[PDB]
Design a protein around this ligand. Structure first.
Ligand SMILES: Cc1ncc(COP(=O)(O)O)c(CN[C@@H](Cc2ccc(O)cc2)C(=O)O)c1O
Ligand SMILES: N[C@@H](Cc1ccc(O)cc1)C(=O)O
Lengths: 488, 487
């Protein structure tokens, strides 16, 4: 009858829960990387909507037969690609409570709980991160934090804030002279955000890094680029320093970076999308030292903090700049020192995201969360040791968190006393391409690659919530079998 | 043990299904608009995270005692504020499946099903809307559609596409001469997009509208604006025409607006966030006549299409512009298909096509039409109830399922004098009092609008749980509070 019948809700919801419990019980059974051909689904499904209803049972049969073959199982214990899609029972339950309530929190009045819980919970997490008080919500009133969907949106919001702060002082006609700084390892979330914000594409500086800094941004290189831009009559605006780059999880030195930036009034945003969460543990916190000298800081709680997709956390030292850049107060939504979160982000409508984070924190506790992260790190260390037992491979850059970067060495295919050169390195790159593709095609595990300084290398990024030690051991076994077979 | 243990997952998920089923069974009892004081919740929760774990039973108890009181119940059958937060069992189940797979679909490779099902379902819905083929996916590989979070994101995307397509021709130094046209009813989501995209604030025209066109944008006003801007040496760029404005669900006339725009190469985006869904019914398709002469089209399926929050559908005639303005080619995501990362803002995508797929499959075209028609019918009934009471008037015509009404000036002025500014101000104050009294009762919730100076009350009916009796009881509450204010 009604699409929100409570009893039908109970029934079908129980059905879907059983379905997902089965899926988690069975996921290790599928090939990690989808093995379908492009366009398979367009062929297997109808071309128009149904006129009459269809049973939920039918739709679930179709989910099993048609959808799942087309999934890359990010939550498989044998998923090691990109960065983890960190999920959890608590995260799922928080998402489902938010979707059940289905409220729209664009201002305080549309649901006081959404806004106030988000404030409380961001303070919680930021305190766990031991962020400086200048970034948290002061009860005596400055700083503050907000939940957004993605890192790209957080960078876009802080970039727009910086842009408007500067152009209000010097005049919009300088918009095409504004310069954004990052490293050549910096995630594309930055150049996309710069494009959308109207920064001229000639003024996004991907500063060159090298093995001498383990591909972190050199402060001397940043200062040279800044001085060149000043000499050309341009306007330095924004630096995006990164903790845990996508390629090799390199780590930028935030302290000296901000020290250079303050010399020129540059806004500094800290992209710690993946690695940020590890900083709740005392032994990892040093990676974000100097954050106190930066202007904004973000992490992706869905990459390594079990929330489920999606939940990016953005803390700012000067929330008024966010608000001023993004604010619009029409009359339909005006109908007191409250927070209107629509003025902190892109979207007007907002999802009750604080629920996921709240439920994760409460269900597991700081101790168990730290244990989870340390489990991932210990598994990565174990993988690196296994590699250390095979002189055919090397570690290309130091393991900073739970990602290991490795490759077959040149001496694994060139049995000669010849000095390295470009051709030898290219052929080594080729055999590593071949090895990774063979492994992925097996379907037993899934890893992605990255090129740093011309060296092509394989990333083992362990963090899937279901992963256990045996999956690490088995993954190494698979790499070794495919190595043996490729090298005869 | 494991934070994703399947047994514990099954147990706590069943518990949560039951908790939410009880919520829907009992939601009618809470005051619709939240009644808590600002700062209420901080007082009740700890100021730091817990070091030890906490039972899900305890968390659920805290949700009942601490969270729900701070909710404004968008899904109460007596909620008629803003526009509906339209949901359904099917949408909830689609979101469940999405979150349970928890896959990121920035690549096709990162989960072909996400990408392909999104394309298929956008075709389905565009076909139900009778969108021109120029807006849908060619089976042979022209146009196409993408799911997103909000209408603001859709407008930001199309505006970025138009901006970059223009500046690629004339040079980025002209960014400060690009003009964006809208009506003075146009949702602020457009002004925000213009600010973000670098459009100069002096160059967003909020063209004035009057009761003469029921506050729809007039082609002659738009053309005067565009000509004046051309005379100033500015560069007209982008028009946002709205079908179903927030304030009074006015309807800009897409046809002649596009005819004016095409004379100047202006990109036309059709914002149909709320009313767009209604066009899956034949009798409503006329509201988007001339969409074929436009450049992009969007609606919010979470407003009037039962998907759950959130889902905004955006179609375009030229996806190449979208991709060329939003494209990035990075080395970390490679080793002919759609890569939707180049169609929207973020790299990460939610498996959003599952919500829409489940809604369409679970209900059907016929039943969805009947749902929307029921909302429209309840709105007609509320309008007739108003008609039975000569203290009230209908300020503008009902286009969809929202009725805009007010206490007439003759309800508070016995005098037989010609209307003037003071009388209208006092009538506004009376209607303010009426709306705030109604809303503070907690029994129902409506929001206000101001069109051409006149302050009026919106009855926007479309919550999934609303029945005829809720409409009737809403009118009873309005009349009781009116008598209490007058006699
Ligand atoms: C014409 C138009 N465009 C856009 C929007 C909203 O754009 P976003 O996707 O960025 O949110 C609205 C509704 N605006 C109201 C009403 C509303 C009602 C229900 C919802 O689920 C969402 C919004 C509001 O957001 O305040 C609108 O009427
Ligand atoms: N953004 C990540 C992919 C990713 C996103 C979200 C996740 O939860 C996990 C991984 C990348 O570029 O590699």
């Amino acid at each position: 009858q009604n699409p929100l019948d409570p009893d039908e809700f109970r029934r079908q919801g129980h059905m879907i829960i059983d379905f997902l419990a089965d899926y988690y019980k069975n996921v290790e059974k599928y090939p990690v990387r989808s093995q379908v051909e492009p366009g398979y689904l367009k062929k297997r499904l109808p071309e128009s909507a149904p006129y009459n209803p269809e049973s939920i049972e039918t739709i679930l049969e179709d989910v099993t037969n048609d959808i799942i073959p087309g999934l890359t199982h990010w939550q498989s214990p044998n998923y090691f690609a990109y960065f983890p899609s960190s999920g959890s029972i608590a995260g799922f339950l928080g998402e489902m409570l938010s979707t059940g309530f289905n409220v729209v929190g664009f201002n305080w009045m549309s649901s006081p709980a959404a806004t106030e819980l988000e404030s409380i919970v961001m303070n919680w997490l930021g305190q766990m991160l031991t962020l400086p008080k200048s970034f948290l919500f002061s009860s005596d009133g400055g700083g503050g934090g907000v939940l957004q969907g993605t890192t790209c949106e957080a960078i876009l919001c802080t970039l727009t804030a910086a842009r408007d702060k500067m152009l209000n002082k010097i005049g919009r006609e300088n918009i095409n002279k504004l310069v954004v700084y990052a490293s050549d390892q910096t995630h594309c979330a930055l150049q996309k955000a710069a494009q959308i914000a109207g920064i001229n594409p000639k003024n996004v500086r991907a500063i060159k890094t090298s093995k001498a800094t383990n591909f972190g941004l050199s402060p001397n290189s940043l200062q040279s680029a800044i001085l060149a831009d000043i000499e050309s009559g341009l306007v330095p605006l924004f630096l995006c320093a990164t903790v845990g780059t996508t390629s090799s999880t390199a780590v930028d030195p935030i302290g000296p970076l901000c020290a250079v930036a303050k010399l020129y009034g540059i806004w500094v945003h800290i992209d710690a999308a993946y690695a940020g969460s590890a900083c709740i543990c005392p032994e990892f916190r040093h990676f974000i030292d100097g954050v106190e000298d930066a202007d904004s800081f973000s992490l992706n709680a869905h990459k390594w903090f079990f929330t489920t997709l999606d939940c990016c956390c953005l803390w700012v030292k000067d929330s008024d700049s966010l608000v001023k850049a993004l604010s619009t107060s029409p009359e339909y939504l005006k109908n007191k020192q409250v927070i209107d979160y629509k003025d902190w982000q892109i979207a007007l409508s907002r999802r009750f995201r604080s629920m996921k984070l709240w439920l994760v924190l409460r269900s597991y506790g700081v101790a168990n969360l730290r244990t989870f992260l340390r489990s991932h790190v210990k598994m990565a260390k174990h993988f690196q040791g296994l590699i250390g037992m095979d002189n055919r491979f090397e570690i290309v850059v130091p393991r900073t968190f739970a990602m290991v970067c490795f490759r077959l060495k040149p001496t694994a295919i060139f049995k000669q006393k010849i000095v390295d050169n470009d051709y030898i390195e290219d052929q080594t790159n080729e055999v590593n391409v071949k090895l990774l593709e063979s492994v992925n095609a097996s379907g037993k595990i899934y890893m992605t690659h990255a090129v740093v300084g011309g060296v092509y290398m394989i990333r083992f990024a362990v963090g899937a919530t279901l992963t256990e030690e045996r999956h690490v051991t088995g993954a190494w076994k698979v790499v070794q079998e495919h190595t043996d077979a490729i090298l005869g």
